[PDB]
Scaffold this active site. Structure first.
Site, short mmCIF file in Angstrom:
data_model
loop_
_atom_site.label_atom_id
_atom_site.label_comp_id
_atom_site.label_asym_id
_atom_site.label_seq_id
_atom_site.Cartn_x
_atom_site.Cartn_y
_atom_site.Cartn_z
N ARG A 1 -3.28 4.76 -2.14
CA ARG A 1 -2.91 3.27 -1.59
C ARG A 1 -2.78 2.20 -2.59
NH1 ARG A 1 -8.38 2.11 2.09
NH2 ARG A 1 -8.69 4.25 1.59
N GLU B 1 1.48 -5.50 10.93
CA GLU B 1 1.13 -4.11 10.73
C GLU B 1 1.76 -3.29 11.68
OE1 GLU B 1 -3.42 -3.33 9.69
OE2 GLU B 1 -1.71 -3.50 8.01
N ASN C 1 -3.59 -5.85 -2.19
CA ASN C 1 -3.82 -7.01 -1.36
C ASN C 1 -5.24 -7.56 -1.15
OD1 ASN C 1 -2.30 -8.78 0.73
ND2 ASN C 1 -3.61 -8.15 2.10
N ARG C 2 -5.93 -7.24 -2.51
CA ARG C 2 -7.21 -7.90 -2.54
C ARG C 2 -7.06 -8.63 -3.92
NH1 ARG C 2 -7.45 -8.44 1.84
NH2 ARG C 2 -7.78 -6.79 3.32
N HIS D 1 3.05 -4.20 6.54
CA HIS D 1 2.05 -3.08 6.51
C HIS D 1 2.11 -2.21 7.37
CE1 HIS D 1 -0.14 -5.17 3.03
NE2 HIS D 1 0.72 -6.10 3.27
N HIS E 1 0.85 -1.21 0.13
CA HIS E 1 0.08 -0.04 -0.11
C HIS E 1 0.85 1.19 -0.04
CE1 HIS E 1 -3.03 -3.20 1.52
NE2 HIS E 1 -3.46 -2.77 0.48
N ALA E 2 0.70 2.08 -1.06
CA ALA E 2 1.69 3.19 -1.33
C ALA E 2 1.83 3.81 -0.18
CB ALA E 2 0.84 3.95 -2.76
N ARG E 3 0.71 4.30 0.56
CA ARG E 3 0.79 5.39 1.56
C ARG E 3 1.45 4.96 2.98
NH1 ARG E 3 -5.58 6.23 2.51
NH2 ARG E 3 -6.03 4.30 3.75
N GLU E 4 1.77 3.82 3.17
CA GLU E 4 2.23 3.04 4.28
C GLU E 4 3.93 3.05 4.24
OE1 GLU E 4 0.29 -0.83 4.52
OE2 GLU E 4 -1.72 0.01 4.47
N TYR F 1 -0.81 0.84 9.65
CA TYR F 1 -0.77 0.96 11.01
C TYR F 1 -1.49 -0.12 11.62
CZ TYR F 1 -4.55 4.21 11.19
OH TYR F 1 -5.81 4.98 11.18
ZN LIG Z 1 -1.15 -2.34 3.93
#
Ligand SMILES: [Zn+2]
Length: 402
Positions: free
Chosen positions: A219, A363, A236-237, A289, A161-164, A291
Site C-alpha cells: 500500500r 471510499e 495519506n499520513r 480511495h 494506496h497502491a492496492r486500491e 473500499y
Molecule cells: Zn486509501
C-alpha cells in the site's frame, strides 16, 4: 495466474470487537503473527463496537481462527482462499489488448493513455508533469476542461494506496465520460466550460507498479532509507496536518509509517507543491480511495469541525442519495474523526486547512466481500455511480464559488 498462486490458502477474516479486551486480543495476535490489516488500516485504529478486516498467511490461518474461537469472538471468513479471489479479479469480457476503461490497467498502459487522451482531445485535455516518484517515474496530471480565463478548479486524485485499484480506474472513467459526453450533454458541457478539473490518475506510481510485479497487497510508497532496510511511507499520513501526532506509526516497517518528515515523499511533496501553487483557483479537493462506500469530510486529525461543517454534511447527504439513485449502492458519510477514527497527516484535512472549503475523501466499492479485489466486471457500475456523485459535487461548487 496473476500471482494468485502466491496467496494459496490465505484468508481474509472479519472480526467484531465490542470492547478493549476484544481489541487487545487482535493486538496480541498481530504481535505474534503476520497480519495485513485491510479495514481499519492498523490495530491502533480499531474502535469499540466495530469490525476489523484482515488478511492472514496460509501457515497462520489455523492459529488465528483457534484464537478467535477460544476467545469466543464473533467473526466470519470473508475470503476462504485468497488465490481464487485474486485470480477472479480479472474477469473482464473485454475482447482486446491494451488499455480499457473496463479493465485494471498497468502503469505503462495508463501512462500511454494519459498522452493519447490528451493528444486526441487537445481542446479539453492537457497533460503536465507535477513531479517525479522516488524511483524516478514522471507523475502526470490531466487538466480537463475547455480553455477559459480565470476558471475555478476542482482537484481530484487517485492511487494514493497502491492496492486500491478501483481508484485509478475511477480517475480514468471520469476522463472517459468527460470526453464522451462533452458537447452532447448540457450539464457536462457547462461543467467543463466553467470549471477545470485537475485529475491525477495515480499518485503512488512506484507502489502501484509494485502491486503488479511483486506484492498485490502493498500500500505504501517505495522510498528507501540508508539505514533501515524497511521500505515505504503511507502517503495519506504524510501531509502537514497534525503530522504524525495521532493514528500513525513512527516505525519505518509499519504500514502506517508517517515518513521521516512531513512531505518526505517526493509524491506527496509534488501534490502539496502543486496545490500551494494553484491555491487561488482550486475550490474543491476530492481524493479517491477504496473500499467501504463512504464519503468523508474533515476533520480526521482532531475532534473539531470546520466552519461550514453543516454545509458539508448536507452536501454529502445529497451526494450519496444521487449516487444510490443509479444502482442502489449505499454510502455512509460524516466527519472522519468520528465516522472512521482519528488520524493525522491526511491530504483532505491538509487541503481544507489551506482554505479549500469543499474537501472530501471517497471510499469506493465494495463493503468487504471482495475488498481491494473488486472484479473488473464491477468497474463500470462502480464508476458510473461515482461519476454521478462527482458531477453533483462539482455542480454544487459552481453555485457556491468563493
Ligand atoms: Zn486509501
Amino acid at each position: 495466474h496473476h500471482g494468485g498462486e502466491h496467496f494459496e490458502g490465505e484468508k481474509v477474516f472479519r472480526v467484531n470487537v465490542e470492547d478493549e479486551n476484544h481489541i487487545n486480543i487482535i493486538r496480541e495476535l498481530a504481535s505474534t503473527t503476520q497480519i495485513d490489516f485491510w479495514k481499519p488500516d492498523s490495530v491502533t485504529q480499531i474502535k469499540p463496537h466495530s469490525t476489523v478486516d484482515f488478511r492472514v498467511k496460509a501457515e497462520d490461518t489455523v492459529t488465528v481462527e483457534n484464537v478467535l474461537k477460544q476467545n469466543e469472538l464473533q467473526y466470519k471468513v470473508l475470503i476462504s482462499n485468497l488465490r481464487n479471489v485474486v485470480e477472479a479479479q480479472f474477469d473482464s469480457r473485454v475482447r482486446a489488448t491494451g488499455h480499457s476503461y473496463e479493465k485494471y490497467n498497468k502503469w505503462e498502459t495508463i501512462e500511454a493513455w494519459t498522452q493519447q487522451v490528451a493528444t486526441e482531445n487537445p481542446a479539453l485535455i492537457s497533460r503536465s508533469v507535477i513531479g517525479t516518484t522516488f524511483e524516478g517515474r514522471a507523475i502526470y496530471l490531466l487538466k480537463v476542461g475547455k480553455a477559459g480565463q480565470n476558471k475555478p478548479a476542482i482537484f481530484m486524485d487517485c492511487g494514493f494506496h497502491a492496492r486500491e485499484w478501483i481508484s485509478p480506474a475511477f480517475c480514468q472513467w471520469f476522463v472517459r465520460e468527460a470526453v464522451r459526453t462533452y458537447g452532447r450533454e448540457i450539464q457536462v458541457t457547462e461543467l467543463l466550460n466553467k470549471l477545470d478539473f485537475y485529475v491525477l490518475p495515480v499518485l503512488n506510481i512506484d507502489g502501484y507498479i509494485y502491486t503488479w510485479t511483486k506484492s498485490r497487497f502493498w500500500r505504501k510508497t517505495r522510498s528507501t532509507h540508508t539505514g533501515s532496510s524497511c521500505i515505504g511511507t503511507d502517503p495519506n499520513r504524510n501531509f502537514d496536518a497534525g503530522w504524525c501526532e495521532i493514528g500513525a506509526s513512527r516505525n519505518p516497517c509499519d504500514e502506517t509509517y508517517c515518513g521521516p518528515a512531513a512531505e518526505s515523499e517526493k509524491e506527496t511533496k509534488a501534490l502539496a507543491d502543486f496545490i500551494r501553487n494553484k491555491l487561488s483557483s482550486i475550490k474543491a479537493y476530492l481524493t479517491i480511495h477504496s473500499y467501504s462506500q463512504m464519503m468523508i469530510y474533515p476533520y480526521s486529525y482532531a475532534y473539531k469541525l470546520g466552519e461550514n461543517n453543516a454545509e458539508l454534511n448536507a452536501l454529502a447527504k445529497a451526494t450519496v442519495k444521487e449516487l444510490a439513485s443509479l444502482h442502489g449502492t449505499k454510502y455512509t458519510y460524516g466527519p472522519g474523526a468520528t465516522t472512521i477514527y482519528p488520524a493525522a497527516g491526511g491530504s483532505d484535512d491538509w487541503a481544507y486547512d489551506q482554505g479549500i472549503r469543499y474537501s472530501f475523501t471517497f471510499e469506493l466499492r465494495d463493503t468487504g466481500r471482495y475488498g481491494f479485489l473488486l472484479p473488473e466486471s464491477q468497474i463500470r457500475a462502480t464508476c458510473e455511480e461515482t461519476f454521478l456523485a462527482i458531477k453533483y459535487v462539482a455542480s454544487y461548487v459552481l453555485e457556491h464559488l468563493y
